[PDB]
UniProtKB/Swiss-Prot annotation:
Binding site for GTP: 181-185, 241-244
Annotated function: Involved in targeting and insertion of nascent membrane proteins into the cytoplasmic membrane. Binds to the hydrophobic signal sequence of the ribosome-nascent chain (RNC) as it emerges from the ribosomes. The SRP-RNC complex is then targeted to the cytoplasmic membrane where it interacts with the SRP receptor FtsY.
One GO BP: SRP-dependent cotranslational protein targeting to membrane
Keyword S-adenosyl-L-methionine in record: no
Full-sequence portion shown in this chain: 3 to 292 of 451
GO cellular component, one term: signal recognition particle
Record's catalysed reaction(s): GTP + H2O = GDP + phosphate + H(+)
UniProt-recorded name of the protein: Signal recognition particle 54 kDa protein
Length: 291
């Protein structure tokens, strides 16, 4: 989406036709690209109308070209569409810190532990995603690869029992950050039951933070789950993964941003270090035409 917007911006800036037509052409392409990115049409409509409004009430400051000013407003609103200028708190000031990852069926846990280990923390991983049999093995592999301890119980399906014993074990070893990987028995469209199912695990572990992992490929359909999730607790955060393996990342981000939830990290690639702290302003700044 942003890479495509980059070319649209370029065509706009290289003053080809009349200003008015240039703007019209640009807005149509923006609308089309956003639609293609699975952004809710209502959000697309509101975004372009807000851009057009600001453009009529805010003349360019002196010395600033009209076309440069237009784009500046476009970048500002794109950032807003994704949540606005906001830098999340990624370094906990409470040790030990227990993070419970949750989400629908279908690396993030390993990436998160890697992120914190690189920051100098003593991390412990708990593999409590029993539904997926390969999950535990995979986790143990990531853990071995990054030098982070992984607790797990082969064949065990009592997710709550695993999480409790795992957290208890790491708390005893005086780990600083403990990440519990869990999944869920439901998918998108069954949010009510999904969240319900989360409660039991949460009560047994009493995590300091609950992080809902969302695959960017779900696009705008992530709205319902994110909305109910964020209202469900005061300690909830979200991670959007596989942003590069889909064209619907814009829809997922905008859908989640529409709930006001805190998107702390975004998963870019499949590599262990491909997890970045997310800030809509910085996310949108990557494609600025002046660098």
């Amino acid at each position: 989406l942003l890479d495509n917007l980059r070319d649209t911006v370029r065509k706009f800036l290289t003053g080809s036709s009349s200003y008015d037509k240039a703007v019209e052409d640009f807005i149509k392409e923006l609308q089309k690209s956003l639609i293609s990115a699975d952004v809710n049409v209502k959000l697309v409509f509101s975004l372009t109308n807000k851009i057009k409004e600001r453009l009529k009430n805010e003349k360019p400051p002196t010395y600033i070209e009209r076309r440069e000013w237009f784009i500046k407003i476009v970048y500002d609103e794109l950032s807003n569409l994704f949540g606005g200028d906001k830098e999340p708190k990624v370094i906990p000031d409470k040790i030990p810190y227990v993070i419970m990852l949750v989400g629908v069926q279908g690396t993030t846990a390993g990436k998160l532990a890697y992120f914190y280990k690189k920051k100098g923390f003593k991390v412990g991983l708990v593999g409590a995603d029993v539904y997926r049999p390969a999950a535990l093995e995979q986790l143990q592999q990531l853990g071995q690869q990054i030098g982070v301890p992984v607790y797990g119980e082969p064949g065990e399906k009592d997710v709550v029992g695993i999480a409790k014993r795992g957290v208890e074990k790491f708390l005893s070893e005086k780990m600083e950050i403990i990440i519990v990987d869990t999944a869920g028995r439901h998918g998108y469209g069954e949010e009510a039951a999904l969240l319900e199912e989360m409660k039991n695990i949460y009560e047994a572990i009493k995590p300091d933070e609950v992080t809902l992992v969302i695959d960017a490929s779900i696009g705008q359909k992530a709205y319902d789950l994110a909305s109910k999730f964020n209202q469900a607790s005061k300690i909830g955060t979200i991670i959007i993964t596989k942003m590069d393996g889909t064209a619907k990342g814009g829809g997922a981000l905008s859908a989640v941003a529409a709930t006001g939830a805190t998107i702390k990290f975004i998963g870019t690639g499949e590599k262990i270090d491909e997890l970045e702290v997310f800030n809509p302003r910085r996310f949108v700044a990557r494609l600025h035409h002046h660098h």
